[PDB]
Amino acid sequence: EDPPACGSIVPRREWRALASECRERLTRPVRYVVVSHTAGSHCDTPASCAQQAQNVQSYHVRNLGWCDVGYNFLIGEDGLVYEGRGWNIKGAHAGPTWNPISIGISFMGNYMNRVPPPRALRAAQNLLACGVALGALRSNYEVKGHRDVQPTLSPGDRLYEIIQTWSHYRA
Amino acid sequence: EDPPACGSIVPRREWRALASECRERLTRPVRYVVVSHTAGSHCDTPASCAQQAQNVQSYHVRNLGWCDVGYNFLIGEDGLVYEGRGWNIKGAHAGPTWNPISIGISFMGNYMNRVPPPRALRAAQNLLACGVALGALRSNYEVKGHRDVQPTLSPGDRLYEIIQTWSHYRA
Amino acid sequence: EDPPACGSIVPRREWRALASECRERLTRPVRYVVVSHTAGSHCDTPASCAQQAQNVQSYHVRNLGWCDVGYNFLIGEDGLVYEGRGWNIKGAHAGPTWNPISIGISFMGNYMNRVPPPRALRAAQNLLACGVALGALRSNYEVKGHRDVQPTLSPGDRLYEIIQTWSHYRA
Amino acid sequence: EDPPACGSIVPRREWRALASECRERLTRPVRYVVVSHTAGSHCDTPASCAQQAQNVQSYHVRNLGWCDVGYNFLIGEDGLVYEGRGWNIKGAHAGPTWNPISIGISFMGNYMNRVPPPRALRAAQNLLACGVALGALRSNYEVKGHRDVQPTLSPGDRLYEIIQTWSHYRA
Numbered sequence: 261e262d263p264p265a266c267g268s269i270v271p272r273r274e275w276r277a278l279a280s281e282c283r284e285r286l287t288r289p290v291r292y293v294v295v296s297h298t299a300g301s302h303c304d305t306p307a308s309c310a311q312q313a314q315n316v317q318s319y320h321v322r323n324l325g326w327c328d329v330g331y332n333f334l335i336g337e338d339g340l341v342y343e344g345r346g347w348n349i350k351g352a353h354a355g356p357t358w359n360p361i362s363i364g365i366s367f368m369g370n371y372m373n374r375v376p377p378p379r380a381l382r383a384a385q386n387l388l389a390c391g392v393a394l395g396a397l398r399s400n401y402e403v404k405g406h407r408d409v410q411p412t413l414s415p416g417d418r419l420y421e422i423i424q425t426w427s428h429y430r431a
Numbered sequence: 432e433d434p435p436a437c438g439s440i441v442p443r444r445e446w447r448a449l450a451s452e453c454r455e456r457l458t459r460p461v462r463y464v465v466v467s468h469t470a471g472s473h474c475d476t477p478a479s480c481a482q483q484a485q486n487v488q489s490y491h492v493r494n495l496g497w498c499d500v501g502y503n504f505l506i507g508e509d510g511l512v513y514e515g516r517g518w519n520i521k522g523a524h525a526g527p528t529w530n531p532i533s534i535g536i537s538f539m540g541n542y543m544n545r546v547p548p549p550r551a552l553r554a555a556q557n558l559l560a561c562g563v564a565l566g567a568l569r570s571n572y573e574v575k576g577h578r579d580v581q582p583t584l585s586p587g588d589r590l591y592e593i594i595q596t597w598s599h600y601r602a
Numbered sequence: 603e604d605p606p607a608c609g610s611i612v613p614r615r616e617w618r619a620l621a622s623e624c625r626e627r628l629t630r631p632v633r634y635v636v637v638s639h640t641a642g643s644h645c646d647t648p649a650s651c652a653q654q655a656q657n658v659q660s661y662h663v664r665n666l667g668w669c670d671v672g673y674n675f676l677i678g679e680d681g682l683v684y685e686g687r688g689w690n691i692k693g694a695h696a697g698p699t700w701n702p703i704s705i706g707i708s709f710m711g712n713y714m715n716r717v718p719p720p721r722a723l724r725a726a727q728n729l730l731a732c733g734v735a736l737g738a739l740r741s742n743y744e745v746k747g748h749r750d751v752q753p754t755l756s757p758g759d760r761l762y763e764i765i766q767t768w769s770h771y772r773a
Numbered sequence: 774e775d776p777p778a779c780g781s782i783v784p785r786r787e788w789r790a791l792a793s794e795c796r797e798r799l800t801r802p803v804r805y806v807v808v809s810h811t812a813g814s815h816c817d818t819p820a821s822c823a824q825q826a827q828n829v830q831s832y833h834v835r836n837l838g839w840c841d842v843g844y845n846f847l848i849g850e851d852g853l854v855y856e857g858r859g860w861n862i863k864g865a866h867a868g869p870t871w872n873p874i875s876i877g878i879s880f881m882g883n884y885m886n887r888v889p890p891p892r893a894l895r896a897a898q899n900l901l902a903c904g905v906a907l908g909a910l911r912s913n914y915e916v917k918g919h920r921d922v923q924p925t926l927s928p929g930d931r932l933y934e935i936i937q938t939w940s941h942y943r944a
């Protein structure tokens with residue numbers, strides 16, 4: 261194995277995650293990346309966004325009864341990636357056919373009428389190349405919108421339109 | 432576009448930077464990184480760290496008459512790396528002996544009696560790897576604190592003592 | 603609910619196919635059939651062909667890193683049909699324009715300078731009649747040579763000459 | 774040292790190409806080069822090679838209805854390079870994945886058994902050095918055989934064996 265300081269990520273603890281109870285592992289390297297939005301309150305400062313991650317995780321664990329926040333990684337408009345279940349653990353974002361074989365990253369907000377800052381998009385794309393550097397993703401990985409693999413308006417029309425233009429996007 | 436990773440550097444235009452006029456180029460690969468502080472105001476939201484980078488640059492351009500902001504890159508307490516003279520333009524930060532044979536990174540704020548948050552440290556940390564991947568920084572680059580190569584309190588007592596504990600630091 | 607079962611097709615499990623990671627669906631009924639060859643050794647036994655099929659799949663999967671073997675079906679000189687991605691999943695045989703709208707069937711061998719045995723030809727024909735009965739293929743499906751849609755020698759000259767005479771062949 | 778120090782290329786109009794209709798661009802500096810062969814006949818005089826470049830384009834444009842010949846450059850055994858879509862326009866040679874991010878150079882002939890002559894090889898390597906010199910290719914670009922990225926025998930065994938020995942070959 262080879263791992264470097266590839267990319268930067270706010271750690272679980274830094275955004276005061278509840279501890280995870282989730283054990284199923286993804287099989288490296290993962291072929292798919294699925295992009296969603298939370299459809300929730302957006303945020304643009306470290307403080308506001310650590311809090312939002314906390315709120316999303318809190319909704320998933322307390323109300324939905326999930327082992328942890330369902331996303332592998334969240335994205336702030338503050339330009340920071342926030343660690344969910346990470347590269348190694350199966351998430352709960354895209355249903356039972358896609359959760360086993362994908363990494364799910366979710367911008368934090370509603371992207372129906374808005375777009376995310378060029379820094380939010382930079383974070384996400386840098387996260388994925390790091391995923392590749394680390395061997396968590398395949399080099400020939402493919403990105404899909406949430407709406408491609410499940411009946412939903414996630415990741416939001418504005419953002420969906422945006423991710424259609426990525427190098428690795430295949431639908 | 433593309434790939435507009437790595438390190439996820441904010442671009443000159445995104446912080447509303449005046450254009451660069453500096454032409455002297457860095458002979459590669461670069462052996463040294465010099466870490467400084469600005470000794471300016473701190474900032475904790477991308478909005479305030481865009482304003483702060485703009486302020487530093489103008490001071491350098493309008494008052495000192497430099498071709499551009501003196502540092503190769505800047506680091507907020509927002510958690511992002513802010514492009515300055517970048518990887519290839521020789522900077523203005525460590526004097527005549529060190530300017531040509533090093534990349535200068537400066538943390539925006541005064542770190543005599545406080546530290547940069549871990550996100551600030553994280554971004555600096557990756558930016559440095561993100562520069563080895565390029566050929567910009569040599570694989571075994573040595574990190575120096577401003578006060579190690581010049582007579583200055585930069586980069587603040589607290590920041591300096593953290594820097595002393597990084598693997599690539601050479602007193 | 604009626605029964606017209608046309609599968610004298612070796613199922614993946616039986617030629618010990620590795621498991622497909624391919625998710626893209628063809629929509630039925632499919633209008634086009636593209637005939638390629640592997641330009642690899644040919645095999646005239648259920649044992650060699652099963653192996654050959656794993657070898658072809660090892661190339662597309664291990665080496666090239668694809669979700670599965672690229673073809674929808676493979677054809678052997680043993681007179682049998684090997685299930686590749688099957689009737690319902692987009693194959694990777696003929697490019698971005700034809701892949702979504704066709705089934706790719708590949709003869710296991712190099713038919714530049716020999717004709718594929720009559721039984722291999724009967725297998726392919728009967729494979730096609732089977733797809734029609736299933737509603738997998740349009741009753742008026744069109745057969746194309748690989749070289750008619752992509753620059754390549756595939757399916758080999760001798761085999762290409764033969765398919766040019768087929769009822770459903772379309773220049 | 775000087776501004777343009779590279780390479781002798783037979784321009785489109787000189788080997789009497791049809792006008793290109795392809796407008797999708799590559800992003801310089803390009804990191805990848807894929808080497809194919811035409812698989813057809815070889816030519817060894819600038820008269821016969823201009824003729825062949827004309828044939829290969831006819832096929833790609835007339836039969837396949839493509840916007841221009843698929844390759845970015847072609848190499849004759851006359852030892853001239855023939856301009857295809859060139860440095861800036863995405864070609865058609867290596868599929869959906871590789872095409873947007875590479876430059877496809879194809880040797881005119883079949884090298885399954887027979888090597889390109891020294892002058893043909895010199896031409897291709899000089900072409901590549903020229904692309905780096907112009908910033909069309911990354912200083913550390915990588916070469917791959919067509920078969921390293923698509924399932925095909927090209928660029929032919931003898932020629933594949935040679936490119937594998939090259940400074941920039943990356944398996």
Ligand SMILES: CCCCCCCCCCCCCC(=O)O
Pocket residue numbers: 389390392393433434436437438564565
């Ligand atoms: C193996 C990881 C995939 C690499 C993804 C490219 C992201 C940029 C980081 C590496 C530096 C490349 C230089 C550049 O493209 O400008």
